[PDB]
Scaffold this active site. Structure first.
Site, mmCIF file in Angstrom:
data_model
loop_
_atom_site.group_PDB
_atom_site.id
_atom_site.type_symbol
_atom_site.label_atom_id
_atom_site.label_comp_id
_atom_site.label_asym_id
_atom_site.label_seq_id
_atom_site.Cartn_x
_atom_site.Cartn_y
_atom_site.Cartn_z
ATOM 1 N N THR A 25 -6.774 -7.431 94.090
ATOM 2 C CA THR A 25 -7.021 -7.343 92.620
ATOM 3 C C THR A 25 -5.919 -8.082 91.872
ATOM 4 O OG1 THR A 25 -8.085 -5.166 92.871
ATOM 5 C CG2 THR A 25 -7.405 -5.807 90.638
ATOM 6 N N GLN A 26 -6.324 -9.026 91.028
ATOM 7 C CA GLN A 26 -5.396 -9.873 90.295
ATOM 8 C C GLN A 26 -5.739 -9.893 88.812
ATOM 9 O OE1 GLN A 26 -4.324 -13.842 91.476
ATOM 10 N NE2 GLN A 26 -4.611 -13.446 93.671
ATOM 11 N N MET A 69 -10.826 -8.657 98.684
ATOM 12 C CA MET A 69 -10.526 -8.133 97.345
ATOM 13 C C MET A 69 -9.199 -8.643 96.778
ATOM 14 S SD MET A 69 -13.111 -6.459 96.287
ATOM 15 C CE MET A 69 -12.550 -5.404 94.953
ATOM 16 N N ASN A 70 -8.860 -9.883 97.118
ATOM 17 C CA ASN A 70 -7.627 -10.520 96.666
ATOM 18 C C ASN A 70 -7.888 -12.015 96.471
ATOM 19 O OD1 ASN A 70 -4.633 -11.672 98.193
ATOM 20 N ND2 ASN A 70 -4.767 -10.895 96.088
ATOM 21 N N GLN A 95 -10.469 -5.498 85.845
ATOM 22 C CA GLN A 95 -10.504 -5.350 87.332
ATOM 23 C C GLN A 95 -11.455 -6.390 87.938
ATOM 24 O OE1 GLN A 95 -11.908 -2.619 90.476
ATOM 25 N NE2 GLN A 95 -10.768 -4.471 91.047
#
Ligand SMILES: *[C@@](C)(CO)[C@](*)(O)[C@H](CC(C)C)NC(=O)[C@H](Cc1ccccc1)NC(=O)[C@H](CC(C)C)NC(=O)[C@H](CCc1ccccc1)NC(=O)CN1CCOCC1
Ligand SMILES: *[C@@](C)(CO)[C@](*)(O)[C@H](CC(C)C)NC(=O)[C@H](Cc1ccccc1)NC(=O)[C@H](CC(C)C)NC(=O)[C@H](CCc1ccccc1)NC(=O)CN1CCOCC1
Ligand SMILES: *[C@@](C)(CO)[C@](*)(O)[C@H](CC(C)C)NC(=O)[C@H](Cc1ccccc1)NC(=O)[C@H](CC(C)C)NC(=O)[C@H](CCc1ccccc1)NC(=O)CN1CCOCC1
Ligand SMILES: [Cl-]
Ligand SMILES: [Mg+2]
Ligand SMILES: [Mg+2]
Lengths: 196, 230, 222, 212, 195, 222, 125, 204, 195
Positions: free
Chosen positions: B1-2, B107-108, C1
């Site tokens: 997450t960024q 998820m990155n 998010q």
């Protein structure tokens, strides 16, 4: 927005960019943020376009009714009416307004009205998102009792920098000169001010 | 997450009869602050491919390093590294597309939108898009960010389908790209006047133009506009 | 998010005949209210007379097709070039999809081909791997528009024999490849009219014992 | 879904509908909700389609491996417990299943086990599982006796699904019947509710709420 | 509150209503009558939010009784049901709506026909041969679909009703302490004491 | 929606597409987004469909009463002022986004109004979901001193950009030309570049196909 | 971890470590099993060079694996405990999953499988 | 708790050669529970027909409200209200409740008695008019109805042929929706005769 | 799951456990035995989260049975209860804890005394003359405080238990379909078939 008003020897000059935005989209690149509330009392508008327009319209109505009964209002009186609206409706408004006018007794005057609705009388004022980037510059370069040409250069150079760094500011630089001589509108295009 | 910090805006591109054109401005925005002005967002790979990147600049610089390292790795034990076994645009793209999808799947993500423009060994024009989600697509014209909304309409008037590609010269194509860049300067609040442009032709090869400026702008009509109604 | 999923729109359609099977899909690719490509194919020949399409989130769709194509390749290596039957392919795809049960491929998958008796076959999958053989299936954005039309025209649902007092149903029969392509073209022109994410072009893949043929038709570009 | 299975004098009846839904969208009317595990074992499916389909198919593989290793058909109790222990390992992960493992063996006789995705495992004579289980219970309970004939038992199972198919919006399509005896399971056909409802209404005189 | 049922047969309407009143982990009462007589040939059962139910029922009762005195005439079951529906339809868009569901069983003396109306708290009205509110319907409707016939007698209707209560007592989670049954016909309203 | 407004020599022109959406579904394929406030003051509306129609009719009604009261032809700035003050009072809850244009004794005028009550002046404007596609065209081809026929061409081209590139916009192009000294000409379906192609098959059913339970004559008379 | 292959083939095709384990069994006290028509009997030898023993507490030669199965042995006593323990655990594990006690064939097959695993695993005898 | 999809239901309307047709299903439910199979959603005021889908209490309330308003109209005007005029009345009434709306999807259908022209119209919950030459759809299976109507419809259908087209559109759309079905009614409307037919459909 | 009770008297421990298994609005079963025999003179009843209960009970049963075979000896009720407590005490700080509450009734053959232990899902152990889990305690504890004596017989204990079930059947909201009663004494474990 980037807006400012500056008093000088012969009166006062208002200055502004011409950019209106919705997020990162420019809804209007030729906006007029310098607006007349009376013959020689004008204001710079920052914040919500809708709120500032609604306010300015109401103030213009109040000063027109004032003039019909009591003659020409003072610049202080105009600022008081702006304050009354901004302060009493602080919960529902997003408006940062600079009021500037020319009396013959009081000469050039500048009042700034931030979000809260407080009133502040100053020699010169700056406001809008783009003003943050020129506090340093304007403080170092402002002098009292400047000439017309000096004040125009001061505003032009200042807003040039504000426009350069702020994404929410751009387009043309509009100006309005308030003196005993009358009311003069000025415009300055990117090709000139960008390469200052 | 960024969350993206220092960002780059639109990248625009199109095909023409003998090759492909791609362009992107030289700005590195820090939110509303127009922080960095000397940022190059077009990165050539060999003499036959240009990768245009928008989005997060820290992630752009990472991708630069990956492409730089890819060239080095391809040259290892490869006598035909500057000939038959040189890096093709399709190879460079598929590699990036693989990486982008693997990163979203962990998820990155690399917070970018990427357009790979180039010419293949057989002369065929290559132009394909990929983004942080790993979504890929190709079209006669491609654009990212605000370019997708404003440039594509203008570029599609020149090349609306496949059959319009042979009929489009490099002069006509570059004119449309430069025009689109002007429109984006009028209307995108996170754009700059300075930009770079790259042409990859099957005959004349790679031409990389730096320090271009938007010009012939219409601002004069602004003086007539007074107030907001009355 | 960060949101790892997206919607690329489009719609797909599979119909099976007696000795053939078609798998159609529009060529438009979108995000939100923008068009990404007017011609981006999402129906693929995977070998062994199996055509496949995975509509929805294109990144997951491409990943799945890529993995199944690769699954076919390794099936040949491991089992002496044996032809992968459509029923076997279907079961294999269920395991591909369910393997990501807790982080799913966001796609509606349809495959088509011929069964081991030479008869037309269409299988359809949900995003997590449930599957079922059918004569007929529409999938994707305009599935809810097209599917009831197919029930009426392919499987003759709600149609009775005239004069029989609604007692005798219209008898089931196979449709010719000509009649099926007519239904496909009409289904997509109707879907294009009433769904914004559908348009630009139609690409049909027909599967007979002779191989895999293609047909392309223009669709409205608004 | 609506699924049921009950035990009686002549063995086990198993009846299911064939509808599949995604919200209010009717996705399929022809889903097979009974899985044939072997000639003597059946499994019913309710809840998440793939979860049920995938893991009950897997259950069949585990049962096959049992009879290869042990040279003997697996018990209904052992088969049901393989499935229940599996889903218990995934408890909290979000599996959605309501299943019934039905079958006959020599040592047990006719046996029905309820197994669900929160790990519950129950032996019993009558069970109804699914969104329309209550509608099926209403008809089944009020007409159930142990001494029902094979003919009457098949009909009651069919009639109970029809009742639920009618009232429950998320049940319908067609009825699939099964009879499980000492000799194994026997398939008793697919029955479309389209034709079956009117046939039952006319012949039985029931469903007076509906416009004839 | 919980279980309220209704069955219309050839010559009468039969209403069954649970006797339990529960609050928290305690059954406070097991002999509660969840009904009010609106007029000599009209009966209304009710179920829903605590307090709201009785307050609403008695408010309707007062209004119908007022009408009867004013006109020296009994409103038809259809007319009473429409009045009740409109009141609930007003209520749903109020500051605090009545959360009450009702069944209205009546005998129309002009038509010589029994009538059963089901109205929910939103103001949704339907005339039915048999009706129920809450979770009760999930068992009883399918049961009645099977066993109900339009030409049944009052005795046949009571046996049909016994079949419903037995099913509920077998499959419902909560103990509702049996039901009070009342019959509405040409001779008015009466209570069955042994059920 | 896509809507535009363009000023020219002796007046002003406005245009609009004709698509109405309901999520991803096209509800109306040929709806009229050009509204008449007064004979020579016209309005183009984007946003919430009911709000744009309702707010335009209310102000149009009050403008008519005002015109009768003052014995004067209505002015654009009056409609502008009345609209903005109404919309501002409702703090954006009335989702009307309008382009107001017309001619009056003062001259020709072109404004836009947003839902929160802010107004803008310009020679060329665009609103709606396809406003970016339209504004791209306007920014590329607009010049000072346009003729009547040049402004119509520019306006329709800006709408077309929305029709093809924006999924929110489609179907036809409506135009209204308001020239000084002349009657305003409303050009309904000025362009129709999205005609539905011939269907492959007629779906006319044999008479008796649908099963019927009851017939009865309905009484409409007294 | 200790990896050495201790059980390996020899030129003649014998696994000497497995065959030397049989010599250990040959050294152990005698054990006999006889099954009748309706019973099984397990007999075991106990060497008498050990007097002053306490037979109450001394480990018995026959061990219950479950309530219905027993196990006797010949060879290294310490080794037998490890097999018995494993067998007892597997007996309870079978009851838990299959809901039925082990057959004698199944329990034997398990124990035999354990013994085999130690003939081709690294680091173990 | 989505008001428009608690009870369920659908309405569809079509035009033909000198005629119009309007049809609806009969289901009234409470989410999954089917409650009534006699709940008609089409009403009429003189020769003007109105179908209403959505929250059932509002369907009933609006019918009663428009009966109220059309009765007063007829008394004062001394004539029956026409479809075009009634359409405007519906729109006005719905928009009056802009910030507390009725959760409905109404559909007007009828033939103008003066001109003889067939007329249909549809609305959203707050009163936006949707006029159409061909067809209007509404309800929980609106997506299905849009697909059926767009493919099956052709212009200038005779009353007998139009009946078949609208009936098949409704039936096949209803069978793909869980909350719609349980019976159906079709109204064929000519200049001075109106036929009402109940359809046989699957009852699940 | 819901109701589990326990009473220790002079010479025995009596456990009563409800028969109902409910899921949603349906009673799936009305003959469920919520207990496992851990050893010949030790019985454990259980209640809590679905699946967890039986999985935990059988896991404990397997471990105690393993111990018995290994040592050819029966663990004392006190020893079994401590083993059970520790397992629950481990569980509560696991990734996914067992949500199970138990009563352990046993007869210690060395002391010739009955023993009743109450253990909750956190691993909270107490030895008691009478015990209960869940909402049952809110009725039964006060009742037993009054009527319980330490020198009661098994028959007196069953009558005392009937008094508890009657009270629960009167005041509890849910229908728990009666109880299965089991007695633990010097002769082992047996079930009362008529209760
Ligand atoms: C500079 C830009 C910043 O100080 C200046 O102050 C100018 C002042 C001039 C125009 C008088 N400010 C703006 O241009 C102003 C920036 C802004 C935005 C939001 C709140 C306060 C200030 N922009 C606007 O007011 C635009 C003008 C429209 C496009 C004609 N309006 C919006 O962006 C509206 C405003 C809604 C609103 C929010 C809070 C208070 C009052 C009004 N917002 C949207 O339409 C929302 N939009 C929906 C789609 O998603 C993107 C956001
Ligand atoms: C009765 C009929 C209804 O309860 C039965 O219980 C049946 C059992 C049969 C099919 C074995 N159950 C269903 O039909 C079941 C209901 C359901 C749905 C979702 C979760 C739990 C229960 N339906 C499904 O499982 C459908 C079957 C498809 C239509 C063939 N599948 C889905 O809804 C899938 C997968 C759902 C899912 C579960 C777990 C993790 C992720 C997803 N979802 C979609 O297809 C998504 N959707 C389809 C429509 O287009 C938008 C995307
Ligand atoms: C382009 C197409 C998009 O920007 C244009 O701007 C047009 C403007 C023209 C038509 C005037 N916009 C639309 O078509 C507009 C898009 C839209 C949708 C929702 C909010 C804002 C804009 N569509 C509509 O307004 C439709 C009109 C229909 C086709 C008759 N209305 C709806 O979709 C309504 C929205 C009503 C609403 C209420 C409260 C606040 C905001 C909007 N939605 C529904 O009817 C959905 N639903 C159906 C089930 O019943 C309950 C309501
Ligand atoms: Cl402004
Ligand atoms: Mg478009
Ligand atoms: Mg149903």
């Amino acid at each position: 927005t980037s807006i400012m008003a500056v008093t000088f020897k012969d009166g006062v000059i208002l200055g502004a960019d011409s950019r209106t935005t919705t997020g990162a989209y420019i809804a209007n690149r030729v906006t007029d943020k310098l607006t007349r509330v009376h013959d020689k009392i004008w204001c710079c508008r920052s914040g919500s376009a809708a709120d500032t327009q609604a306010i300015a319209d109401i103030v213009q109505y109040h000063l027109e009714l004032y003039t019909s009964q009591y003659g020409t209002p003072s610049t202080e009186t105009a600022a008081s009416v702006f304050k009354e609206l901004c302060y009493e409706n602080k919960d529902n408004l997003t408006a940062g307004i600079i009021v500037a006018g020319y009396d013959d007794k009081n000469k050039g005057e500048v009042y700034t009205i931030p979000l809260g609705g407080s009133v502040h009388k100053l020699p010169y004022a700056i406001a809008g998102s783009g003003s943050t980037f020129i506090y340093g510059y304007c403080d170092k370069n402002f002098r009292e009792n400047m000439s017309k040409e000096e004040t125009v250069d001061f505003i032009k150079h200042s807003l040039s920098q504000a426009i350069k760094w702020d994404g929410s500011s751009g387009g043309v630089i509009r100006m309005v000169v308030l003196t005993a001589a009358g009311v003069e509108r000025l415009i300055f295009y990117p090709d000139e001010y960008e390469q200052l | 997450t960024q969350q993206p910090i220092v960002t780059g805006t639109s990248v625009i591109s199109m095909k023409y009869d003998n090759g492909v054109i791609i362009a992107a401005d030289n700005l590195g925005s820090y939110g509303s602050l127009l922080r960095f002005n000397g940022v190059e967002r077009l990165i050539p790979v060999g003499d036959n491919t240009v990768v245009g990147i928008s989005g997060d600049i820290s992630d752009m610089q990472h991708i630069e390093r990956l492409l730089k390292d890819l060239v080095t790795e391809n040259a290892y034990d490869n006598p035909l590294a500057d000939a038959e076994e040189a890096l093709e645009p399709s190879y460079i793209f598929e590699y990036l597309a693989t990486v982008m999808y693997q990163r979203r799947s962990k998820m990155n993500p690399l917070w970018n939108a990427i357009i790979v423009a180039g010419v293949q060994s057989n002369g065929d024009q290559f132009l394909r898009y990929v983004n942080l989600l790993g979504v890929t697509y190709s079209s006669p014209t491609l654009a990212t960010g605000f370019g997708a909304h404003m440039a594509n309409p203008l570029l599609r008037k020149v090349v609306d389908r496949e059959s319009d590609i042979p009929k489009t010269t490099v002069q006509v194509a570059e004119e449309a790209i430069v025009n689109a860049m002007r429109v984006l300067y009028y209307r995108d609040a996170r754009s700059s006047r300075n930009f770079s442009l790259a042409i990859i032709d099957k005959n004349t090869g790679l031409t990389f133009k730096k320090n271009l400026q938007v010009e012939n702008m219409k601002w004069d009509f602004a003086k007539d506009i007074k107030g907001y109604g009355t | 998010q960060f949101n790892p999923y997206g919607d690329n729109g489009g719609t797909i359609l599979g119909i099976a005949g007696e000795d053939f099977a078609v798998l159609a899909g529009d060529t438009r690719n979108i995000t939100d209210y923008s068009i990404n490509s007017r011609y981006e194919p999402k129906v693929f020949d995977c070998g062994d007379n199996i055509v496949m399409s995975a509509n929805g989130f294109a990144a997951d769709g491409d990943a799945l097709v890529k993995r199944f194509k690769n699954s076919v390749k390794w099936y040949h290596f491991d089992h002496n070039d044996k032809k992968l039957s459509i029923n076997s392919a279907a079961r294999n795809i269920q395991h591909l999809l369910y393997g990501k049960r807790f982080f799913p491929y966001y796609v509606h998958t349809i495959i088509a081909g011929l069964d081991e008796d030479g008869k037309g076959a269409v299988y359809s999958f949900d995003p997590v791997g449930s599957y079922e053989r059918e004569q007929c299936r529409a999938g994707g954005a305009a599935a809810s528009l097209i599917m009831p039309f197919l029930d009426n025209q392919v499987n003759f649902k709600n149609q009775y024999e005239p004069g029989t007092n609604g007692k005798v149903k219209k008898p089931l029969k196979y449709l010719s490849v000509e009649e099926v392509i007519k239904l496909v073209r009409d289904s997509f022109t109707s879907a294009t009219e009433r769904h914004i994410q559908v348009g630009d072009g139609l690409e049909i893949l027909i599967v007979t014992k002779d191989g895999v043929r293609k047909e392309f038709y223009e669709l409205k570009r608004d | 879904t609506t699924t049921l299975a009950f035990r009686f004098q002549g063995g086990i009846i198993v009846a299911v509908d064939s509808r599949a839904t995604a919200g209010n969208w009717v996705a399929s009317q022809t889903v097979k909700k009974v899985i044939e595990i072997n000639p003597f074992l059946l499994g019913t499916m309710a809840g998440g389609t793939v979860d049920c389909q995938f893991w009950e198919t897997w259950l069949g593989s585990q049962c096959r491996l049992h009879e290869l290793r042990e040279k003997e058909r697996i018990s209904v109790a052992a088969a049901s417990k393989i499935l229940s222990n599996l889903v218990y390992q995934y408890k909290g992960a979000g599996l959605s299943m309501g299943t019934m493992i039905c079958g006959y063996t020599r040592k047990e006789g006719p046996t029905i086990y309820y197994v669900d995705s929160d790990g519950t495992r129950l032996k019993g004579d009558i069970f109804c599982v699914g969104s329309g289980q209550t509608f099926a219970y209403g008809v089944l309970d009020s007409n159930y006796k142990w001494d029902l004939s094979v003919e009457d038992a098949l009909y009651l199972g069919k009639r109970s699904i029809l009742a639920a198919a009618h009232r429950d919006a998320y049940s319908g399509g067609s009825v699939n019947l099964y009879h499980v005896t000492e000799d194994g399971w026997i398939y008793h056909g697919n029955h479309d509710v389209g034709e079956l409802f009117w046939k039952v209404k006319e012949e039985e005189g029931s469903f007076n709420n509906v416009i004839g | 509150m919980d279980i309220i049922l209704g069955i219309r047969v050839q010559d009468s309407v039969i209403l069954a209503s649970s006797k339990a009143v529960t609050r928290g982990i305690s059954v406070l009462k097991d002999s509660d009558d969840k009904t009010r007589q609106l007029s000599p040939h009209t009966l209304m059962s009710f179920a829903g939010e605590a307090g709201d139910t009785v307050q609403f029922a008695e408010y309707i009762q007062a209004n119908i009784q007022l009408y009867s005195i004013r006109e020296d005439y009994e409103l038809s079951p259809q007319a009473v049901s429409s009045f009740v529906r409109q009141e609930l339809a007003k209520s749903i868009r109020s500051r605090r709506p009545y959360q009450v569901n009702v069944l209205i069983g009546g005998y129309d003396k002009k038509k010589n026909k029994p009538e059963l109306y089901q109205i929910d708290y939103l103001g949704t009205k339907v005339e039915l041969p048999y009706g129920a509110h809450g979770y009760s319907g999930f068992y009883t409707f399918s049961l009645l679909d099977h066993h109900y016939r339009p030409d049944m007698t009052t005795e046949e209707g009571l046996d049909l009703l016994k079949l419903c209560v037995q099913e509920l007592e077998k499959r419902m989670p909560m103990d509702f302490k049996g039901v009070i049954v009342k019959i509405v016909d040409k001779d008015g309203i009466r209570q069955v004491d042994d059920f | 929606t896509t809507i535009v407004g363009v000023k020219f020599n002796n007046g002003v022109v406005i245009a609009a597409d004709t698509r109405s959406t309901q999520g991803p579904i096209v509800a109306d394929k040929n709806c009229a987004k050009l509204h008449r406030i007064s004979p020579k003051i016209w309005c183009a509306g984007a946003g919430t469909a009911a709000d744009t129609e309702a707010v335009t009719q209310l102000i149009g009604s009050n403008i008519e009463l005002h015109s009768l009261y003052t014995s004067r032809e209505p002015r654009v700035v009056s409609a502008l002022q009345m609209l903005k003050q109404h919309l501002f009072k409702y703090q954006g809850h009335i989702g009307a986004y309008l382009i107001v244009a017309g001619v009056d004794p003062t001259g020709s005028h072109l404004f836009s109004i947003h839902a929160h009550g802010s107004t803008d002046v310009g020679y060329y404007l665009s609103l709606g979901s396809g406003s970016l596609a339209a504004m791209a065209v306007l920014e590329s081809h607009w010049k000072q001193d346009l003729t009547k026929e040049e402004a119509i061409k520019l306006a329709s081209d800006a709408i077309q950009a929305g029709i093809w590139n924006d999924l929110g916009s489609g179907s036809n192009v409506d135009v209204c030309v308001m020239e000084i000294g002349k009657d305003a000409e409303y050009l309904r379906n000025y362009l129709t570049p999205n005609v539905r192609e011939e269907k492959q098959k007629s779906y006319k059913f044999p008479r008796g196909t649908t099963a019927v339970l009851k017939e009865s004559i309905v009484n409409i008379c007294d | 971890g200790y990896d050495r292959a201790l059980s390996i083939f020899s030129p003649d095709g014998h696994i000497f470590q497995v065959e030397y384990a049989l010599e250990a069994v040959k050294r152990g006290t005698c054990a006999v099993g006889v099954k009748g028509k309706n019973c099984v009997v397990l007999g075991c030898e106990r060497r008498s060079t050990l007097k002053l023993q306490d037979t109450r507490i001394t480990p018995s030669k026959v061990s219950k694996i479950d309530s219905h199965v027993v196990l006797s042995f010949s060879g290294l006593n310490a080794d037998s405990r490890i097999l018995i323990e494993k067998a007892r655990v597997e007996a309870q594990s079978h009851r838990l999953t299959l809901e039925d006690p082990v057959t004698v064939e199944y329990l034997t097959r398990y124990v035999a499988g354990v013994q085999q695993r130690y003939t081709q695993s690294g680091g173990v005898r | 708790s989505d008001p428009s999809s608690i009870n369920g239901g659908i309405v569809v309307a079509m035009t033909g050669k000198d005629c119009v047709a309007i049809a609806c299903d009969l289901r009234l439910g409470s989410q999954s529970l089917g409650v009534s199979n006699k709940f008609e959603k089409i009403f009429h005021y003189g020769h003007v027909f109105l179908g209403i889908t959505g929250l059932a209490t509002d369907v009933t309330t609006l019918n009663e409200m428009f009966r109220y308003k059309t009765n007063l109209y007829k008394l004062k005007e001394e004539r029956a209200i026409e479809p075009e005029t009634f359409t405007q009345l519906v729109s006005s009434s719905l928009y009056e409740r802009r910030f507390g709306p009725y959760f409905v999807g109404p559909v007007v259908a009828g033939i103008n008695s003066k001109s003889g022209k067939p007329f249909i119209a549809g609305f959203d919950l707050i009163g936006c008019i949707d006029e159409a030459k061909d067809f209007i759809v509404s309800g929980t299976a609106s997506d299905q109805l849009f697909g059926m109507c767009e493919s099956l419809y052709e212009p200038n259908l005779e009353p007998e042929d139009l009946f078949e087209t609208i009936s098949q559109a409704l039936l096949n759309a209803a069978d793909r929706d869980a909350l719609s079905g349980w019976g159906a009614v079709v109204y064929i409307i000519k200049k001075d005769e109106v036929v009402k037919r109940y359809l046989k459909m699957r009852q699940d």
